[PDB]
Design an enzyme around this catalytic site. Structure first.
Site, PDB file in Angstrom:
ATOM      1  N   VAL A  70      -0.690  -0.606   5.923  1.00  0.00           N
ATOM      2  CA  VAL A  70      -0.405  -1.530   7.009  1.00  0.00           C
ATOM      3  C   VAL A  70       0.879  -1.167   7.756  1.00  0.00           C
ATOM      4  O   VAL A  70       1.920  -0.942   7.145  1.00  0.00           O
ATOM      5  CB  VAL A  70      -0.286  -2.973   6.464  1.00  0.00           C
ATOM      6  CG1 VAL A  70       0.142  -3.923   7.566  1.00  0.00           C
ATOM      7  CG2 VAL A  70      -1.620  -3.408   5.875  1.00  0.00           C
ATOM      8  N   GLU A  91      -2.505  -3.163  -7.006  1.00  0.00           N
ATOM      9  CA  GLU A  91      -3.449  -2.065  -7.153  1.00  0.00           C
ATOM     10  C   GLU A  91      -4.876  -2.591  -7.044  1.00  0.00           C
ATOM     11  O   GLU A  91      -5.245  -3.538  -7.728  1.00  0.00           O
ATOM     12  CB  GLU A  91      -3.278  -1.383  -8.513  1.00  0.00           C
ATOM     13  CG  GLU A  91      -1.897  -0.846  -8.777  1.00  0.00           C
ATOM     14  CD  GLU A  91      -1.513   0.269  -7.835  1.00  0.00           C
ATOM     15  OE1 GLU A  91      -2.122   1.358  -7.916  1.00  0.00           O
ATOM     16  OE2 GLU A  91      -0.596   0.056  -7.009  1.00  0.00           O
ATOM     17  N   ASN A 149       4.308   1.185   3.688  1.00  0.00           N
ATOM     18  CA  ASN A 149       4.498   0.002   4.524  1.00  0.00           C
ATOM     19  C   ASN A 149       5.891  -0.052   5.150  1.00  0.00           C
ATOM     20  O   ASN A 149       6.241  -1.025   5.813  1.00  0.00           O
ATOM     21  CB  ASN A 149       4.242  -1.273   3.717  1.00  0.00           C
ATOM     22  CG  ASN A 149       2.773  -1.465   3.378  1.00  0.00           C
ATOM     23  OD1 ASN A 149       2.439  -2.157   2.417  1.00  0.00           O
ATOM     24  ND2 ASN A 149       1.888  -0.863   4.171  1.00  0.00           N
ATOM     25  N   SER A 180       0.828  -1.237   0.000  1.00  0.00           N
ATOM     26  CA  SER A 180       0.000   0.000   0.000  1.00  0.00           C
ATOM     27  C   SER A 180       0.846   1.265   0.000  1.00  0.00           C
ATOM     28  O   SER A 180       1.877   1.329   0.660  1.00  0.00           O
ATOM     29  CB  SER A 180      -0.915   0.026   1.230  1.00  0.00           C
ATOM     30  OG  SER A 180      -1.829  -1.048   1.208  1.00  0.00           O
ATOM     31  N   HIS A 222      -2.903  -1.912  -1.211  1.00  0.00           N
ATOM     32  CA  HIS A 222      -2.505  -3.090  -1.980  1.00  0.00           C
ATOM     33  C   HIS A 222      -2.986  -4.287  -1.187  1.00  0.00           C
ATOM     34  O   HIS A 222      -2.615  -4.458  -0.027  1.00  0.00           O
ATOM     35  CB  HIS A 222      -0.985  -3.161  -2.127  1.00  0.00           C
ATOM     36  CG  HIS A 222      -0.412  -2.092  -2.999  1.00  0.00           C
ATOM     37  ND1 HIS A 222       0.888  -1.652  -2.877  1.00  0.00           N
ATOM     38  CD2 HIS A 222      -0.959  -1.379  -4.012  1.00  0.00           C
ATOM     39  CE1 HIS A 222       1.118  -0.711  -3.775  1.00  0.00           C
ATOM     40  NE2 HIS A 222       0.013  -0.527  -4.477  1.00  0.00           N
TER      41      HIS A 222
END
Lengths: 522, 153, 522, 153
Positions: C70, C455, C244, C1, C23
């Site tokens: 995340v 994506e 991330n 992500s 993601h």
């Protein structure tokens, strides 16, 4: 100077390619090149050579061609003498000087002359000169007994085969230069040429400084034959090259190492970025054509930027000064090519002058030092980002001082001016990675700079049948007062628009402007 | 496979193209060298004459102070005299080419006196020895042993 | 992500920009995103969220917007228990387990069910699970007393000011995630969010493994308040980001260091190449526009190639094998971008799989290791060129085995297939440096691979008045059997052709296809 | 400067655009959540029902072996029961929104029974507690504490 020779197996059509690319001063008279073509019932030669010379050094014809680059063959030794009791100390004994009373005339400003006496002293080493500080120095030059220099070149550029060429080269009458050969048979050769004296001890650094002149131990009398010098013929890499770098990577993969030759023959200093580019451009490309070959000669990459910007930009971006931040973004958006419209090039040079010295040869600033194991990818990185940013701050000030802005177009400041012709420049310093070279001078009041040295005679030949060659001479073929052939090629240089070199009689007749028939009284 | 038929000149002539590049055709080697000297004199006459003057060890005598250091360097290293020996040691056939080259330069100067700069006319006539001397100076005492490296300047 | 938030001072028009770029798996049901728009007299929310969730996690409206990535907040501890005498050892004493007899039904293949007993045991730490090897593990989860998770998100995405947003965030009801905020006032914020227990000793590596379950010393009971977690608001760099990577370079220049927080909050592992690109793309550009912003989101550079090819290519060129030489020239001519027509990309991935491991996260092969001092330019170089060339030899074999050639077009093998739609792919693995991500699966019999993760929901918003937003959802907005809205966006993804997100009533009315009036019985 | 005038709905309706994106307009919050549940049921009904079934700790009971591990994980961690507590602890106003959402899902299923997959119909009707349970499972027992990390698989 650059030099490339490509074997048939590496080309698309199967013909050897050769590049003549000497870099020399654009103003020194004895360094001026002259282009000519000689045809006789027995031979044909085309090429450039220094004015006053009766033989063509950068020559080629329908069968072969050669080119030269500087190798700095150390063929002379400077000895520091110990003067004592009217002579000099040698092996614990006072030896007498050999003296000679000479004289010469000196012209005065008014046109008359005065006689000046000149005493010529010689030690066993050779002629003695006294330095300002008083140091007595004796100069010993190798090959003072080799009178066939001019004839050897003549026999080389006129050879009927690689064997005859090699036999000529073997006479050892040409005292220096790296020499690259290529012919239509498909043979390519690189030779670290020169007359090198055999020495019992000492590396190249030792023999380049002042050698003790009070000991017969350092008095050489022998010289190396061709067999002892670094040479490469038809290497597996299919190419040969030299850009003034030591002879350790004349091809890739290499065919020998530094330890295979006396340590006093050549230095083991880091190869310049231009030399590294030379190896990459040849080794990385295949199926070469003359067109592709020529396009490669024009490369003007700021290789030092590729090795430094990755570390420099992030560090400069944390500096509170918005101008430094702006400079970093300007350098980050740059494609790292020395094109005419580049707005970051000048600023990068100024930073480089501080980071790597005025000649851009410094190594102290790099994180990863040069290594012969990674000859084309080192040095790399910025050792001290923080210090590098301070240098950038200063570079910004220097750029504005010299050019009036941090983003002035490269080609607006860098100009090629000959007589009434004023064209935009491109490419730059070889030590920054530019293969095509233009050593720009310091800017004038208005930030305008011009080439002081660099591309002069440039020719690329394909040994097809008949041969095909293109070339250009930066400063024309004539420098006599009022000639129309001084600035008539600089425009083409500016546009990288090469002239076809005319060797065939029908091409010559079709381009004739002047005819000078002559009668030579034998 | 062999190269294309080489041209066989039937008369001596210089064909200059649009860029002032001379294409010299000689019925023999000496004639070719003569034309080459003539061409060089026409294109770079003044500077060639100046250079040959220096190779004789007469730079200071002809042009003064700015040429004195080189004069001392060349005389002390015995360049002019060694050029005489080297000239005398040339093979008969090659020496003839050196003489023809020199003759070409003199010829051009003689036929076009007003094209040669006044301050350099005193150098004429030049000879094959002057040619050897200049080559010797350039190779051995410029490229191999430069005065700056010895004089420590 | 990925996640970007840009302050007004860094944009051309003076409006904040926000990027929502999660993601996640393209097949896991509970990870499926759904796009919707909610309008009420009191509020408006637009965005994506996981199916089954009543609140929008990736939301924005006319005033603000947020996004998540995340962070792997370690909010649970696994304790290794020492079983003894029917209980477990704790501070030298045998403690009893808390047991509970439960039961559940299990459906058989024929449709009937059987009753299975289930004993639930708990230590002072929490529920106990037995591993295959027999190890008894107790799981302690933080925040089991925080019931306001859904309401906190609702109050966040519905906040009238940054202050209200912050007050909501401060409740600590959302257990994990990095959260990035941006509004029309010009405020941008990055928060390392989650419920982290206060620990007396040990770093993150210690607390991620099995912690001794026989000592009250490791039994935490407190959690950190928002004030203790890494946060950044309106930094001088004018931007905030997270891909991330650990929270150590959320902006540039940074505003804090790892030593300012407990060493058990986040790891200090090297930032991935994608994360490094994220920082570079934002810090290196200025005067951003929404158009320019979107173009940057699409970057798919093979950054690992920039850090390795310089050393790898020269070394591979000396290998006698003409195929290795050919592979090296193929990689040398590549622009290092993961475009559809790239013929060297696949081969590079295969070499990378060996050089840096199957997940491309390996560090052992590099000459210069990663350093927080050069967070966006390290690691770099190839430590063992010779070994790297052996890996390339193997990579050539693996490339042919998987794809049938060493130069097959990237987009010919990499495909995006949804129902009857089959389009060429572009971009790739984030660990190789690609910012836009498509985690390609292993190829099939024919060398065809498709995205397995990457994506999903993609949206870029400019907080102008009224706001302007564009977006795309890889796998459509519906997955029900026979829907026409599953594969109707993959083509646009393929061409990077974003839909304008419709928030204004007049835009919505102009695009209506279906109307569902409804009566809700309160 | 202030944002553009927000739209004020006068009736409850869902306007779907060309890409199946629902634009839900409600006269109040509960109505908006009801429409949202209805929209989600229409777009992802089957999977949402399956997920809610698992959150109840009835995955093994409804679908068998492939769902047994998660069932043990959720029951042992007391997820279903804690969801009841959390549901009971919701603010009055927010709980109403959770109930409306659930009601939307049931409504859709009731009005379009043939659109819901047979094997997942047994989950109906869903409730606000099911919604809380799923959110609790996703956040705490997937994102924070996953079974693989504990079971060592």
């Amino acid at each position: 100077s650059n030099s490339w020779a490509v074997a048939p197996g590496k080309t698309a059509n199967g013909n050897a390619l050769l590049l003549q690319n000497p870099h020399l001063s654009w103003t020194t008279d004895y360094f001026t090149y002259y282009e000519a073509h000689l045809v006789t019932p027995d031979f044909e030669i085309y090429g450039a050579t220094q004015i006053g010379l009766p033989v063509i050094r950068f020559a080629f014809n329908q069968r072969m061609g050669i080119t030269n680059t500087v190798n700095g063959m150390v063929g002379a030794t400077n000895y520091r003498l110990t003067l004592q009791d009217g002579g000099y100390l040698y092996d614990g004994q006072v030896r007498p000087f050999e003296r000679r009373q000479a004289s010469y005339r000196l012209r005065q400003a008014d046109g008359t002359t005065v006689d000046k006496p000149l005493e010529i002293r010689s030690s066993v080493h050779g002629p003695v000169f006294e330095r300002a500080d008083g140091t007595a120095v004796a100069v010993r030059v190798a090959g003072l007994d080799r009178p066939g220099m001019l004839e050897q070149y003549f026999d080389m550029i006129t050879a009927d085969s690689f064997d005859d060429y090699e036999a000529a080269l073997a006479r050892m009458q040409v005292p220096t230069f790296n020499i690259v050969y290529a012919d239509r048979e498909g043979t390519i050769n690189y030779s670290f040429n020169g007359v090198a004296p055999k020495r019992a001890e000492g590396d190249i650094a030792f023999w380049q400084g002042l050698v003790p002149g009070d000991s017969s131990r350092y008095l050489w009398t022998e010289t190396h034959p061709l067999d002892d010098l670094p040479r490469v013929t038809n290497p597996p890499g299919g190419f040969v090259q030299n850009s003034n770098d030591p002879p350790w990577t004349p091809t890739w993969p290499v065919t020998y190492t530094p330890k295979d030759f006396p340590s006093y023959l050549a230095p083991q200093t880091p190869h310049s970025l231009r030399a590294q580019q030379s190896v990459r451009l040849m080794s990385e490309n295949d199926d070469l054509t003359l067109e592709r070959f020529m396009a490669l000669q024009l490369s003007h990459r700021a290789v030092m930027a590729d090795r430094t910007l990755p570390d420099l930009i992030p560090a400069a971006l944390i500096d509170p000064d918005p101008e430094v931040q702006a400079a970093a973004r300007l350098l980050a958006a740059w494609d790292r090519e020395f094109t005419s419209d580049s707005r970051a090039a000048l600023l990068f040079e100024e930073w480089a002058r501080l980071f790597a010295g005025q000649n851009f040869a410094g190594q102290a600033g790099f994180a990863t030092p040069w290594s012969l194991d990674k000859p084309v990818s080192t040095p790399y990185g910025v050792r001290d980002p923080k210090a590098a940013v301070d240098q950038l701050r200063t570079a910004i000030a220097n750029t504005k001082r010299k050019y009036g802005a941090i983003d002035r177009p490269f080609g607006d400041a860098s100009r090629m001016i000959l007589n009434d012709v004023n064209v935009p420049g491109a490419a730059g310093y070889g030590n920054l990675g530019s293969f095509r070279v233009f050593t720009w001078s310091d800017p004038d009041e208005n930030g305008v700079r011009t080439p002081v040295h660099g591309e002069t005679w440039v020719a690329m030949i394909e040994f097809s049948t008949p041969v095909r060659a293109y070339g250009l001479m930066s400063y024309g073929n004539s420098r006599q007062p009022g000639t129309t052939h001084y600035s008539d090629q600089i425009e083409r240089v500016s546009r990288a628009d090469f002239r076809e070199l005319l060797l065939r009689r029908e091409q010559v007749e079709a381009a004739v402007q002047e005819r000078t028939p002559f009668n030579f009284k034998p | 496979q062999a190269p294309i038929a080489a041209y066989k000149p039937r008369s001596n002539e210089i064909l200059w193209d649009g860029y002032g590049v001379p294409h010299i055709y000689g019925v023999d080697a000496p004639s070719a060298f003569y034309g080459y000297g003539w061409a060089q004199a026409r294109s770079h006459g003044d500077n060639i004459l100046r250079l040959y003057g220096e190779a004789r060890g007469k730079g200071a005598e002809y042009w003064g102070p700015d040429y004195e250091q080189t004069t001392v360097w060349l005389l002390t290293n015995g360049v002019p005299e060694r050029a005489q020996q080297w000239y005398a040691q040339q093979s008969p056939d090659f020496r003839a080419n050196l003489d023809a080259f020199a003759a070409g330069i003199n010829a051009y100067a003689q036929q076009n006196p007003d094209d040669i700069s006044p301050e350099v006319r005193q150098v004429l006539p030049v000879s094959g020895a002057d040619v050897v001397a200049h080559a010797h100076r350039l190779m051995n005492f410029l490229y191999v042993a430069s005065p700056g490296r010895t004089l420590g300047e």
